[PDB]
Design a protein around this nucleic acid. Structure first.
Lengths: 159, 222, 58, 185, 51, 172
RNA sequence: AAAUAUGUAAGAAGUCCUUGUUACUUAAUUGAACGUGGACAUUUGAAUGAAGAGCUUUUAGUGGGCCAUUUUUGGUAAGCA
RNA sequence: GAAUACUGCCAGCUGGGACUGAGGACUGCGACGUAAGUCAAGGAUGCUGGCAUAAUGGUUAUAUGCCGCCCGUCUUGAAAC
């Protein structure tokens, strides 16, 4: 009855991005991947080789190996009562870098710079970012902002 | 020979000056609180005089109490209750309000009653139901020696300094509140009003944010 | 009498009872799926640097 | 009623007293649990936690491991400690005249040490001499090197030596192990 | 061995918080507030009474 | 809901760089608490203006007391409500002493006749009518006659005792 | 193109600066990976909580399920599947 | 120019009633007092009276009020027609 082939229930995910069909950028082939980088997996329907399984679409992981036209990715797959470690081998068309890695990196850079400046200045390094604090007091004026008395409206059809 | 009189007298001379500095700290805290309320009163009056509207600053502190029992709680609210330390009906804690907590509060809303407490309730509640968590062992406070011992490394020497750190939500609030055991409150003495409890406060129920009417509920049930 | 195929009820309960858990990442991880062209040269780099540390120690 | 998250009324899982009923062992336990209570040294706590163990977890330590221990930098004139048993090694031909403290000594080990000029003392005498671990060096033997650990974790692609009485061909050298007889593990 | 609460048992209320003695001396809960004779604005009153 | 009060509530749609100093809307609300008052405020203001309390700011809430609570008045009351088939507007007239007691009588009358609860009622306008001879209701303008007078035959006395010895009367 | 759910990250295993190995790579000490010595000296890099975390061994019973709320398929509908 | 309501505070005063008295030399934190010492301050003491008896308590039968379906078992489910 049920069929569970390698490309089952993927009518839509390997589709291509309306009015961006066809060939691919070469920025993807020009991108450089080292070991330890963080990469988000997104498949491509044009390229049949190096294709990941449908489970790994949208996931992200670290890279552990590099080859002529592909990279070795690590992923942590949930199965049962444990997380197993899967090792993918993916061509570069099905992958991209992660931006949270770069923004965390430049945050660390800002932290090093601010710690240097705070060592030059003295006290109040203050690097830990806190959540949205509650607001504080203030005074609202009525100059040109006189309060208008609203009221709920009746019922009408205007169908 | 006996070699006890000098040590005893030295002990008394030391704890005497501890008592002194505690006294002169509490006095300053009292002046601080009364000045703080008087100034916002005069501010709300001065804005009316000017033909304006002085808004009040948002509250920093939320006392929250559990309302629903133990049975038939979904997992994510159950975990949030465990994280706020509400393992039991009619248990209560304090909370430093922020974006990270208000989401938990709207998530846990149909199982708690939370609100903005007052200095009077904090005092009247800590003095009666004051227990501390140290090797855990849930010790009653009953003395400032415990607090000197287990929070001297944050300047907290006394129970008054503790309630100060709680009200003026200070840097050491996490440590102080986690040192506090969760408060094991009773049921309300004059009832809840409201014969059906598990509706929102606004629809004629109990749960959710009663903003300042929490100080009545806790003073009843404590 | 039929034969009920399956029911996913209670399986997540069994999982979260013993606590679905992470694989305990390690320092210096495995090196089996890696390029042998890289591994073979890493080996002799380590040979040479061990020799050089021994020379500098003496 | 209260919400629980872990198991209540659980045992700690650690042994807090020896399973034996040997009198001298109980006396040593009494001594070292006085000490660990009243001297704030980690050595005594480690010692009683070693005394509580079982025979597979206090293995024998060779007389030659002690020598390569003493070959360490600075550990030439330290007092060696073993909560267990020492055993002779004919593979070594030289030995220093150190002081060794343990609770069971083989005759070969005793003879070797005293022939080198050493000392074969007990933990009692050790506590009299160094009551809180002064210039001590503890040694432990290998746990996982025994035979029953070969079989633990037996499964495909594991290399964990199946439980078997008779060996050779005709005894688990076939399908599941050959590339020809179907598959290999 | 037994918890005597403050808010009764003045002995415990004085073991804790010695400021309670002076708090009762000046009594500091029936504290009077000085008179201030401010007055709100016609804009405020109009916005209040306006329908 | 309860024994009622009246509040004014003010809301802001707190500022940004696009629109600093916004237009500061106001509403007159009947409710028993500040909490319910501002909840209803955000309800109506969300229905009308593009705002919710996640993007707003209550700058003021003030209770309102009756100007002349010892003087009897007549209030015209425009409302809407939702029935089991649709929703309808309605006008009533209430002879009462206070703007809030009129509202209590209104909610009770609506629950009695139309079986409309609090959740399905909106008060569009409460307004005292100043002059007479503009009432539109017999049940109000019959109380405005010169030298009004009436009995209540056969009032009932809720006596405290259980055994009486008197076979009592009902004279007013 | 939502809502709910969903992956990763929020450091000291890191950041910056000298200098060493390679049989790999590069036109090229050029790069890659691994190291060497200093500084950044645990405000050492969101919130909350922790009835401590982790690792093994061995073994029982079970391997007929059912009800309710929401989303549902087949069905006239069913205390139906 | 007032009081009165409503809300809130007093480490504000004063009464009435019910339940409990754990522990067993001292050690401590405190308060009053110049002092001596005293204390409602790390768990109750004092005074007075009655009973030689069934006073109290226990066991058993009976009466009364309320509750209480026959055990074991297969079962998703047994008081089971």
């Amino acid at each position: 009855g049920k069929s569970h082939g390698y490309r089952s229930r993927t009518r839509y995910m390997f589709q291509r991005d309306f009015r961006k069909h066809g060939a691919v950028h070469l920025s993807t082939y020009l991108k450089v991947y080292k070991v330890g980088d963080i990469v988000d997996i997104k498949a491509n329907g044009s390229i049949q080789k190096g294709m990941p399984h449908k489970f790994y679409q949208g996931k992200t992981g670290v890279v552990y190996n590099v080859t002529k036209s592909s990279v070795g990715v690590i992923i942590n797959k949930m199965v049962g009562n444990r997380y197993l470690e899967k090792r993918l081998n993916l061509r570069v068309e099905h992958i991209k870098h992660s931006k949270c890695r770069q923004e965390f990196l430049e945050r660390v850079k800002a932290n090093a710079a601010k710690r240097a400046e705070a060592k030059a200045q003295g006290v109040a390094v203050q690097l830990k970012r806190q959540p949205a604090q509650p607001r504080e007091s203030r005074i609202v004026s009525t100059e040109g902002n006189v309060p208008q008395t609203l009221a709920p409206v009746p019922y009408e059809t205007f169908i | 020979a006996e070699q006890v009189a000098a040590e005893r007298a030295a002990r008394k001379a030391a704890n005497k000056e501890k008592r002194a500095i505690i006294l002169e700290r509490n006095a300053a805290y009292q002046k601080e609180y009364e000045t703080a309320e008087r100034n916002i009163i005069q501010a709300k009056r001065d804005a009316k005089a000017a033909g304006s509207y002085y808004v009040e600053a948002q509250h920093k502190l939320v006392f929250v109490v559990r309302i629903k029992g133990i049975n038939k709680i979904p997992p994510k609210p159950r975990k949030v209750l465990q994280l706020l330390r509400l393992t039991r009906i009619n248990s209560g804690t304090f909370v430093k309000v922020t974006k990270a907590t208000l989401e938990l509060l709207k998530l846990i809303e149909p199982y708690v009653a939370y609100g903005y407490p007052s200095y009077s309730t904090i005092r009247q509640l800590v003095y009666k139901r004051g227990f501390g968590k140290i090797n855990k062992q849930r010790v009653p406070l009953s003395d400032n020696a415990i607090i000197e011992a287990n929070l001297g490394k944050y300047g907290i020497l006394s129970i008054d300094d503790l309630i100060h750190e709680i009200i003026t939500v200070g840097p050491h609030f996490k440590q102080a509140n986690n040192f506090l055991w969760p408060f094991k409150l009773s049921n309300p003495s004059g009832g809840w009003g409201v014969p059906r409890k598990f509706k929102h406060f606004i629809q004629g129920g109990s749960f959710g944010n009663r903003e300042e009417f929490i100080n009545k509920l806790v003073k009843s049930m404590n | 009498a039929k034969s009920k195929n399956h029911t996913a009820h209670n399986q997540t309960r069994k999982a979260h009872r013993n606590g679905i858990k992470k694989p305990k990442t390690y320092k210096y991880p495995s090196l089996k799926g890696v390029d042998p062209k890289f591994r073979r040269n890493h080996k002799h780099a380590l040979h040479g640097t061990a020799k050089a540390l021994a020379a500098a120690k003496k | 009623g209260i919400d629980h998250t872990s198991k209540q009324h659980k045992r700690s899982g650690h042994r807090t007293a020896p399973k034996s009923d040997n009198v001298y062992l109980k006396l040593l336990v009494k001594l070292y649990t006085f000490l660990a209570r009243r001297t704030d040294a980690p050595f005594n706590k480690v010692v009683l936690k070693a005394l509580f163990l079982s025979k597979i977890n206090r293995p024998p330590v060779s007389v030659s491991r002690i020598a390569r221990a003493l070959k360490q930098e600075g550990a030439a004139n330290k007092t060696v400690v073993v909560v267990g048993t020492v055993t002779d090694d004919a593979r070594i031909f030289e030995f220093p005249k150190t002081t060794v403290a343990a609770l069971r000594f083989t005759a070969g080990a005793r003879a070797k040490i005293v022939k080198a000029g050493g000392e074969c003392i007990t933990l009692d005498q050790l506590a009299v001499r160094a009551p809180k671990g002064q210039n001590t060096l503890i040694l432990r033997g290998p746990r996982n090197s025994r035979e029953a650990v070969r079989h633990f974790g037996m499964g495909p692609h594991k290399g964990k030596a199946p439980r078997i009485l008779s060996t050779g061909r005709k005894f688990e050298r076939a399908r599941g192990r050959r590339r020809s007889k179907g598959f290999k593990v | 061995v037994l918890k005597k609460n403050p808010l009764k048992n003045k002995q415990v209320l004085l073991r804790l918080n010695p400021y309670a003695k002076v708090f009762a001396a000046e009594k500091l809960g029936s504290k009077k507030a000085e008179k201030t004779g401010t007055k709100p604005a016609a804009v405020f009153t109009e916005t209040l009474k306006h329908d | 809901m309860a024994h009622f009060k009246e509040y004014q509530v003010i809301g802001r749609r707190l500022p940004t760089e696009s629109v600093p100093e916004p237009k500061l809307f106001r509403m007159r609300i009947f409710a028993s608490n500040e909490v319910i008052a501002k909840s209803r405020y955000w309800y109506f203001l969300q229905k009308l203006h593009k705002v919710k309390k996640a993007s707003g700011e209550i700058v003021s809430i003030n209770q309102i007391n009756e100007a002349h609570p010892t003087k009897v008045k007549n209030f015209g009351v425009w409302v809407r409500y939702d029935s089991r088939s649709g929703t309808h507007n309605m006008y009533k007239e209430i002879r009462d002493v206070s703007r809030v007691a009129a509202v209590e009588t209104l909610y009770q009358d609506m629950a009695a006749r139309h079986r409309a609860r609090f959740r399905s009622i909106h008060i569009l306008k409460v307004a005292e009518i100043e002059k007479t001879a503009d009432v539109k209701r017999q049940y109000v303008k019959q109380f405005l006659t010169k030298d009004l007078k009436f009995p209540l035959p056969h009032r009932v006395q809720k006596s405290t005792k259980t055994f009486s010895y008197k076979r009592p009367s009902t004279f007013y």
